[model samples]
Target: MLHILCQGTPFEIGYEHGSAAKAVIARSIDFAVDLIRGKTKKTDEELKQVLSQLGRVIEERWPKYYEEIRGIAKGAERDVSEIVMLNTRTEFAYGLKAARDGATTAYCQLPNGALQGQNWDFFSATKENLIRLTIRQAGLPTIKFITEAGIIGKVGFNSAGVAVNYNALHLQGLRPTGVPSHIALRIALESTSPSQAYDRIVEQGGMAASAFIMVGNGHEAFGLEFSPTSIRKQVLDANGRMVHTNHCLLQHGKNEKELDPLPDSWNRHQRMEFLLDGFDGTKQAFAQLWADEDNYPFSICRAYEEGKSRGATLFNIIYDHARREATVRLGRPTNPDEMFVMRFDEEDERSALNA
Candidate 1:
């Protein structure tokens, strides 16, 4: 377990109390400044630049969660930016994680769009980390995370201790918008509290085309189904273990037959039942279930049916309250050889000063 800390004060504190016009000027300057330089098509160089820029931005914004986010992004680099971009959730779920209990969470596997080419999944942590990062990046502390979509934790845990896992929704034609994926991750990472993060999502920014969000904080978990360009439905469990698969669960009621139209949809319900049977009913069972590497092939590998010999499995995840004391798997489970695993330790103020 590693814990890292920085002693510097917030860079924006001085200007925070400035007049409205002064604030406006600062905001304009922030927009004009391209902290992230280099061209996008140049993936290797751009990714390296993005990592460095992300570090600087996090250190300036939310030093607390900066290192973790930096480390996670670096670790996930083997995959393309599209994987990370498509696998994110909004701020609502962050608050729900902290407020709930029991440890059950949600999962969604999303397909890649223009910049992204494949499907991926997201297992979220606390909201504080999510929102704080957002406030820091915008260089504006006043603007909060808010959302109209009822789905909680676009990828967050709340004061209630509820956790959310998100699956990106794939469509025919999708376009990018303001508040890039990195910015969204920054906001969700720094959210000091769940509600604060939810507020940030509901505020202003952009609209997600299609996505599946799971809101549960260890106690109660549910699935929120969304369409490509239609209304979203919420499906809650009555105090039992509830799991979500790739397709929309809401349609199970009236349009069961029409579901055939969506060929790409996975048999998530069947998978969930198999998972529950394999894991049994208990928190320990859940953790053990999560730790299972074999399941990755049948459970997580989206291309399982395609017989594509090459595919990615669950790599690493930032668990609830994980902070510096989290565990990350380095390589595929089937491989007997374990990849590199590094523990994190933040610098203490006195220690840094003494040095």
Candidate 2:
């Protein structure tokens, strides 16, 4: 249950700094694991069970990135227990995608489950969530990175206000060697501005990619899709705000002819449009988005139909503009739920000038 809160001014930065990156990763992992394990009365066997369940899920969903996960932990010299704890922290299960219309706040639910919610015990006992701050300095004018993993919160935010999050998807031509997705994301978040972040993505030899990134600076946002050899960027009209699920955007859909489009899955595009159509750009409106729990096509959370496995929700996130905070919750947005929340604070704006 790692939560991230980010708020800041603006700037442009890139990757290649490599100064304290390993240390940064190690610190973040240590902090997040401490939170996830929590102060509880649990035997070593109980902890082992939690890790075992999470490890199995990793093998199933992110097999390709499994080595990368091992690499990060190994590079940091962390033990297996520590690695498992980190995975449980950033693994978000549910959230709400939302927008505000005048005095009204509208939200749709997005619920995602991690191996049937094995991490739920943390919340059931202590009711405390996981929150973590991650910073990566890659290029000029360093960008600050913060992510609440267990929650569906923002992962990359620059001093320039540009922020991005990566959702790993399925794409062909799976190769082993490429810039790690998490590292690339950290580089993007560390950039000074959206354009700078975009530049870093291209200049860094790209990646063997399968990810959807939501990039935004308070005023604007976009959804970008990536593959091993292709890059697609979709700009969201500034009518209100935007949200992204596990799909590509329309603009990119046109450019990438061979790439398949999710025409039937109206969750990502339609819901974002719904939010923009209902936007008043107020804080209350943002909070309402955080609380919504409607069903598919309009709801933030979507469940598998009859043919697909039931009880498994796709994703969950919540947004609030008034508090200048965005909360990303994983698992289910309803009560009897165990989800992580990242609250972006006002003071984070100093990330750019913190040096």
Candidate 3:
């Protein structure tokens, strides 16, 4: 896996990321263009307008993030709007069409301890464009996350023992104004604890629909449902297990409209439930769960299929909060023995900074 370690202020972090992963960043930009054209079928001008709205919201509500994005654009020699569009791609895609199906499966268990992970199913085209990014800012917790090149954040954990997994949701009425989910994800990863992570998401006020699963070292876990107009949170169940797919599972009242579950969503959810029924919260168990093929190409561990509009699983990750470790497998899902592992500690973190 490719790794980029960035430090200093937010802008410097962005700059280092852009410079270190320039090739991947360029590929990510191309992928975004192809994705927008294929998925939304919108013209360049229309897409520019969408990016403009996203930029306005970021500037208004999260100016610091906006500056980081600016530094990324400058370092990559790309337009600021391009980076903005990458960050807001999910909002634009879901807002324009709510019925789209993408596969993402995640689960968390706090049995005796907290263990969390997810399969990031997305366009297979992004398989090579994603990177493992670790950022350290003076005042914020040192964070590590997997993201498409040029995007600020996605799934990752901080050195403070806070981990987050992201899943996309489809909703009927998404607000056109507020912080985009990706930006909010970056904010959440900067938290020093699970409660702080949850508070960050709540304070941001999501502009689109999505779900975030947050897990902490002390057996703290929470699932948050974010819609355009409101936010809802649910603590882990009595069994200390929380599982989520790509659909809205919470009831946020009648005013908050949720799109009906896509067929794949239902199938994936059932398969996950079946797997977790007897799970032991071990890395091996989670690996088998993610690699389950109950639904074939659309199974929890997805694979690319020709002529399929929805992509496959780009990566599978298992995060052990107590151990400060993240084990990831790139490309199609495979056996547990094939994964690459990254362990975070203050000593290694300082070494990364110096290097």
Candidate 4:
């Protein structure tokens, strides 16, 4: 749990985070660039040029976040363009790899609230670069998220009783002018309500890449799938549960589906539905179901597979909106570490800080 806490204005918060996690950030940059280059075969200068364009779009449309990003660069004593590459890594890496393999997530409704969980799957090499980031800012919900080191937004609940999770899509094409995936997640986390986050995402809705942003507010949850061209939504149904893997669930789905449809995606989706059906109608039951390895290396609880696999499950996180608490199980579930729990009550300092 490479956790770092940052408080103050946006830039200050980022600077504190950058200074505290400099080595991690540096390592993340190297890994991200390598993965991206493995697919696109582009040099650093060419990549920086493309990244700079994305940075410009963010600075113009979301100045606050861009300021924080720049702060990370200054604090890390690195060039700003390199930091941009980390945030826009998906636009380049996934866009080129057309990566169809990804995380599996569920939003199950409780009688009182909701239970959200996900096995965040990604390249095994990326596991070491991920971090648990906490931010404290006035007038916004305090955020505690797990993301790649330099990126600002990701999966984690905020102090405002709102929780957000993510799953990337490997559809063809990239719209550099649109909102990047991580930035959209950050925008959603800043909101005070589920509906507001939904509205804000739609308003800032031209997605640079495809991804699912599943959101919950202790009452209900929505799975918003954003593609560069279209937007779709999913929610809990008669069974009071919503599930998502890498592919889109609606029409206007993956354009790159046939290119590299991903071998395990279909089976993994079916396996999850089956497990949900077998669920004992309790949080405890829904929780352990993440351990199913029905298809070996392709199962829901993905293992490193000796780095021969396209991706591995880095961590499994459960966000309980009813309790305003999140529990994370690092590494593969079969041989995992003790759970890490995160909870925040920023209301006390929110009043004093804002005043």
Candidate 5:
């Protein structure tokens, strides 16, 4: 596990990220190219034109994020549009292709706060490039999360006692000008509370594709399902737990243009409930639940089989927002190879911020 601390202006932070991980970010662009080709069947020039629409919205609403993207281009020695493509790869590749096969998210309520995390499954080829990043700016909440080399944000928590977890929902349609969920996750982490995170994601043009984001802090949690046109929110259930798989739970198939639900989505959701039973707050309990092997290759901890799948669990992240602590287990939860922890309140006072 590599930790990169980036402080200063947005561009400077991105520049540091680009230069330090230049080769890995270069591989990021290469990965984006293959995915774009395989998923969109479009040329690079056309890709540029398509990304321009997203760039315009990003520049108008989130100008600093666009600046960071530009800085990454200069430092990584890749085109700005290429960095944009990778930043919003969730929109460009999965936006239209709708190849949903992985990820399971859940959270447990504590006395005052909660525990939230997810099994993020993706192509194992990109696992080596995954890096944990900490971003510090004068006015914003310092955010730390695991992301690929070039893209700015994904799944992680911030110094504000806020954490955001991801679950991919492969729905039909794309809104070219809407904010991508990847960036929206970054926006959510910058806020001070779960409602603030929810409000930020609902702002501007909303989300481009259908996605699921579990947002929470030390005391509260909510499951947000985003579509191009609308947003659905779910609070913790009677058991004081939040669990989500890959499909849309609140919205039906009629208006959001829902695709056929995958079998694994339903199965994984049930497994999470069965394992949790009532309420278990131990991190080890969560790990044991994720390491379940009932579904084999498509189990809670996904694995790759020769002809069955190519994606595996990249990492499992658990954020103890109450204590402002986060832990990540890289590789597989069944036999985790690397484990590390981050305590955001170690030097910073947890009670200073009222999230």
Candidate 6:
């Protein structure tokens, strides 16, 4: 994993992040170019036009993020359009990709407190593009998150005890008009509490279909499902467990769709719920769930097989909100016991020195 530390303006932070992962960023951009070309079957000129339109939308809607993309492009010695395309890929999924069968998340309110975690599943070819970024701005909350080399945010928690887990869903209401989901995730990381995070999600109004499992201070937790037009909030069950995969759980007003393109999403969601049914609200119990491979190539803890195009579990992460700690397994958790652990509080000191 590439560990990065940057402080100051958004542009400066993004520049350092891009400079640290230049090689991976190049590879990530190439992979995205290939994916877009293959899926859209668009000529170079057409692809550039789409990117240009998206770039203008981002600049108008989220100016700071647009500046960050500009800084990343400058630092990586690439075009600003490429960085914008990478950050806004989710907005083009309707016509370019079938489904984001990319993740599964679970939240539990245990006696010890709340714990949230998920598996980041993506294209096997882009596995090397992952990075762990930690940013400390002057006025915002310190944040640590796992993202692609050029992208700004994914799953992460802040030093203020707010933790977020993300999943993708395919819905009919998805459009390319509102804020991208990853940008919304970054906004959540900037929040100091769960309520603030929820408000941010609500205010951003996602441009794609995504799910966010948010927990704060190990006590307050909620699940938010977002499409382009609306948002649905879900609370934990009486058993204090909530699970989401690449399918919608709550009934939003949008013309919701199933994971038909990738039916394994339904299976994975079911398997996660089944595992949670028997769980005792301990890290060990969740570890076993993360290690589950009941569906072989389509299990929750997926491994890249010969012909599966959906991808493998790029990483596995379990966040302990009570302790502000994250236990991470870089690849699939074949042996959950052998995972790297990081504390948000302690990371600041170590990152500051390294910076």
Model 2 earns a TM-score of 0.52
> lDDT per residue, candidate 6, 1-355, as tens digits?
7788877788998799878888999999988877766666568887788789888888998898888888889889899888987887777545445435478888888888787898988776676787888888755677888888899877888777778888766665556667777888888888878888888777765655444454445878787776666577888888888888877778776365543437788899888888888887777787778878888778888877876645888888888877778888877887542367767565564443444
Q: Summarize candidate 3's per-residue lDDT along 1-355 as a digit string, tens digits.
A: 6799887777897898888888888898887777657656568898788788878888888888888898898888888898998888767666445224354545466545567778877766677887888787765677888888898978888777778787877655556686677877887787878888777776764556554454455567777766767677757666666778877778777776766656777788877877777777776777777778776777887766776536777787778666778888886675432467776777545633454
Q: What is the alpha-carbon lDDT of model 1 when measured against the actual structure?
A: 0.31
Cα lDDT for residue 203, model 6? 76
In model 6, how large is the Cα lDDT of residue 217? Answer: 54
Candidate 2 lDDT tens digits, 233-320: 7664443334445454444433343223233234544644575567554444543443344454234443334553232322333333
Candidate 3: minimum summed lDDT over ten consecutive residues — where? 96-105
> Any residue pairs clashing in model 6, and if so which?
none
For each candidate in turn, the TM-score is: 0.43, 0.52, 0.90, 0.93, 0.93, 0.91
- Least accurate stretch of 10 residues (summed lDDT) in model 2? 94-103
**Predicted structure 2: lDDT:** 0.41
Cα lDDT tens digits, model 5, 1-355, are: 7688777788998898888878998887887676557766677788788778777878787899998988888889988888888888777675444344378898888675677889998788788888888887666777889988888879998887889998887667678778888888888878888888887787765678778898888777898887777778988889888899988778554766766656888998998888888546676676677777778788889898878866889898888766788888998888887998887643333223322
Off by over 4 Å in 6: 205-217, 258-261, 308-310, 335-338, 346-355
Q: Which has the higher lDDT value, candidate number 2 or candidate number 6?
A: 6
Candidate 3: TM-score?
A: 0.90
The local lDDT score (0 to 100) that residue 48 gets in candidate 6 is 82
Report the Cα lDDT for candidate 6: 0.77
Give a tens-digit lDDT track for model 1, residues 251-342: 43343222221222354345444676554333234334443433344443322234532233323233333222122332222331132322
Off by over 4 Å in 5: 94-101, 345-355
Comparing 1 with 4 on TM-score, the higher-scoring candidate is 4
Candidate 4, number of clashes: 0
| Deviating ranges (above 4 Å) for candidate 3 | 39-42, 96-105, 108-112, 210-215, 307-309, 335-338, 347-355
Off by over 4 Å in 4: 98-101, 253-259, 306-308, 346-355
